[PDB]
Amino acid sequence: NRPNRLIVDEAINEDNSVVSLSQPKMDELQLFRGDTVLLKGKKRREAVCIVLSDDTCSDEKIRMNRVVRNNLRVRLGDVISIQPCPDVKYGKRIHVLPIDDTVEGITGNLFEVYLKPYFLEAYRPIRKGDIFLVRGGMRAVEFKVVETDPSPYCIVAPDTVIHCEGEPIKREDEEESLNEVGYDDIGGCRKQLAQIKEMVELPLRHPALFKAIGVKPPRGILLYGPPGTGKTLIARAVANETGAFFFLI
Amino acid sequence: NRPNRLIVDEAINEDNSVVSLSQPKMDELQLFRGDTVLLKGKKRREAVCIVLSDDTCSDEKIRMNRVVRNNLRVRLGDVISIQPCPDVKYGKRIHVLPIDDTVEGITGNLFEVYLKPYFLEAYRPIRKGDIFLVRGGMRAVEFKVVETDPSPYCIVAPDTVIHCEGEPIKREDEEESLNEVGYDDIGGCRKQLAQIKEMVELPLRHPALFKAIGVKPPRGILLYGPPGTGKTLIARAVANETGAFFFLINGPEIMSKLAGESESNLRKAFEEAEKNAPAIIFIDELDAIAPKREKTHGEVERRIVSQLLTLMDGLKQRAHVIVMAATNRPNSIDPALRRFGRFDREVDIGIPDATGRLEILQIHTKNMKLADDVDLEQVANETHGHVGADLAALCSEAALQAIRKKMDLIDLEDETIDAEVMNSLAVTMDDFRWALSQSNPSALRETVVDVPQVTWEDIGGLEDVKRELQELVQYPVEHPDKFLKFGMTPSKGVLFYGPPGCGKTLLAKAIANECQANFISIKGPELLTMWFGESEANVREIFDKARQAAPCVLFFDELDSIAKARGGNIGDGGGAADRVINQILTEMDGMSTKKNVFIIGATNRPDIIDPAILRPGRLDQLIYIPLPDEKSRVAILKANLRKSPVAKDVDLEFLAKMTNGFSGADLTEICQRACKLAIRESIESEIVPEIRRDHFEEAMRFARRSVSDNDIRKYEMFAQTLQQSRGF
Lengths: 249, 728
Ligand SMILES: Nc1ncnc2c1ncn2[C@@H]1O[C@H](COP(=O)(O)OP(=O)(O)OP(O)(O)=S)[C@@H](O)[C@H]1O
Ligand SMILES: Nc1ncnc2c1ncn2[C@@H]1O[C@H](COP(=O)(O)OP(=O)(O)OP(O)(O)=S)[C@@H](O)[C@H]1O
Ligand SMILES: Nc1ncnc2c1ncn2[C@@H]1O[C@H](COP(=O)(O)OP(=O)(O)OP(O)(O)=S)[C@@H](O)[C@H]1O
Ligand SMILES: [Mg+2]
Ligand SMILES: [Mg+2]
Ligand SMILES: [Mg+2]
Hints:
This is part of a larger assembly, with 2 copies of chain A.
Chain A: E1 5-7, E2 18-21, H1 23-28, E3 36-40, E4 46-53, H2 66-69, E5 79-84, E6 94-98, H3 111-119, E7 131-136, E8 139-148, H4 191-205, H5 207-213, H6 231-240
Parallel strand pairs in A: 2-4
Antiparallel strand pairs in A: 1-5, 3-4, 3-5, 6-8, 7-8
The site of one magnesium ion has 5 residues of chain B, from helix 6.
């Protein structure tokens, strides 16, 4: 029923928004390697991205990047609604504005350092109200388009002009700070992260189901190891990747 | 007088309401196997059920299920009034309603999952206002009929229609919650439960009788055992199965209070217990509040201990108050508490055995749905160091693993899933295997007190020593009358000596198995490491533990390691007696003769064993186990090859005559090498499943002898002259 629902979990490609599917999926959804796809999430918001051909990922799973995970307001293990978009898009004007929480201490023409060698030779699609992360200059800033042609009808093209404004917009509470620690900020602990996920996220993400079943949830997880191994980092990441209230003692 | 009164005690049939009587009873009450009977209890209420034919239950007892025990408002040990009901009954309409305390979180048509595959092929009777328990969908809910034809006039029939209402009724205080812990919620502890019942329920159930007699009631029951063994569970069950007010005191909770406020809490708890009828005070984690006063820092803790001692000493027989305590560290308890008048009865809740842990697994999976390949007996056999908490965690992990593969069939978008899919989710044996794969047994280091599985069939030859061990162990425990007639006190000790790998450990385990007696194995290296902490009380605890397990056999294996700690009898000139061995001799001399504890020692270094071990009264039965001869080698090979698919052309007597100085371990090594060659052949052929003659020939080509001819001569010398030893 409804062969359009995808399970959301973290991707492995260390790049910008690029979704990865399994071998039967691009043939079942009649989309090729270099195709434009549309992501639809909760709270009546959309996302547009480019698929990637993968085989040794899983039987039925999409791969979801953290850059646009907050764009759809969806966390780990969520269900997403995909849709192929065989619509030709080209950008003419895209009024883009950074956020004055991560761009402080940076001056000059930020385009030629951050946006210019990030757009060309990529051909990425941009939707209305997209928060995409750009790394460079020994720091990372997220960026926000605020005004363009009707959504999305936009891909990265050399024929797209841009203009700076010099007044970055503030960050509202509707979105989560990408500067916070996530699952992608932990390296070298994937088995431990897998165990923590299996023991933590299912009861937290589905509290009503776990209350209905009446089965014992593991509530005494104890991390241990040598100092500086990321125990606090892992705990904060698990807190952030789930919609659970976090109290620190 | 009145041959209609029945004593009420818990049943053994793991089903719905089915009463079980003794052989003379159904003939005396003219009722057959498939007959309808009527149960009449107190407070003017009745119950209807179906009898069961039983013979090996007791002389005069009924068996009463917990489902309908609360239906009659009768507890354990009560007297019930039975009546046969040869009245034909058939249900037409039965308005049934659940209770909204256990059905929350369940939606959909609960009939087709819970009531439909529970009614048919059963033909059970239903009475007015019956609370019957139905398990399924990884949870248990009780159910209540509220309206039907005049009572009871109802049995389960396919012609009975039903209709849902969607509004479950609330639970009143007239009945007890079946979700609470009862006697049936504890597995693997029946002897301990029997002792607790005998020591607790008679004074509590009959306080007036115990006050009239003027005899001392045991008021200091102290439960102890490894953590997670169900001490709290047992205490709560005993509280629930008797009509005694239960006051719970938590160690850490009391200790967390401010100074001068915890004493107020203890005094208030004792006052409440004394005021409110017969009562039980349970102090969970007693070592938290009352450690050894020699090892404690603050004076507030000592005030707490003194207050507890005063409150315990202030207990009168008229108070009808029983104080129970649980601690996983009984030796950390202040010794003043364990004296007479405060805590005299001590009950050891030990690690469950294979049967006990199988019972625990059944108790924890009875709510879950198991696939047809689920072998709970195999799971119990594969779990060794697990305790009740470990098995509960294993079952929960298996259920979670089953759910984790069902996240798509279950709409995770939906708030509260319905039971028509929850029951469809079944826990496979693969899920149990996965859960067992990653599990940490807590009681791995604990000493095992159990009947070993190895029997005489696992031992080849050695018939004479088998007969001698039978005469030494079975006869004093089976026919004491002959021994007291002829006036000889049985010998309490046996020492096994001989070449290594000839079956000294197997003999002790097999003689433990045949007598069906508890077996405790203490190895020499274990003693040497457990004494290195200068803990003289541990080897005393070993003998104490053996004392409570009587009839028990205490086996000290690898005494050579103990004797090699200081070199031996001659060595460089000093003696090998050190550390444990002196305390072991002291314990052997200080053990009661009438106790059925038997001590067996084994060593393959008879030269260096200290003489004091061999003194009469400690270990005077010197049994020498030699290397197997021709026929014993055939027997050993046959015993070792029982579990392997040996081909017909394999000539075992040929192998026996081709091996002369080989011991049992050497023959086992030969069999293992032949099996490993067969495994290699199978692996190579994969890129047949019968071990052949050629494999045995190739294994015999590389077979090695682990006992020298000079060693054989020396053992023969010690086989004849070892009683001498002591003296020079
Ligand atoms: N596995 C890791 N992956 C990425 N960064 C890591 C990892 N482990 C440590 N770090 C970095 O090192 C910092 C220190 O790690 P912490 O989690 O704060 O130390 P810790 O694990 O709490 O151990 P303590 O606090 O000294 S006992 C983190 O904030 C990260 O920046
Ligand atoms: N013999 C048993 N039969 C059935 N369930 C058991 C048994 N032993 C333990 N359990 C289960 O394991 C849980 C933990 O047991 P508890 O009695 O709470 O532990 P404990 O005996 O108090 O030992 P502590 O508190 O760690 S010192 C119980 O609530 C049961 O669910
Ligand atoms: N009579 C026997 N019948 C069958 N197998 C035997 C026999 N004697 C020894 N074995 C094998 O040898 C192994 C060791 O048995 P043990 O009773 O431990 O021998 P032991 O005399 O105690 O000497 P060690 O030091 O323990 S090897 C057993 O597990 C069997 O595989
Ligand atoms: Mg830390
Ligand atoms: Mg407890
Ligand atoms: Mg041995």
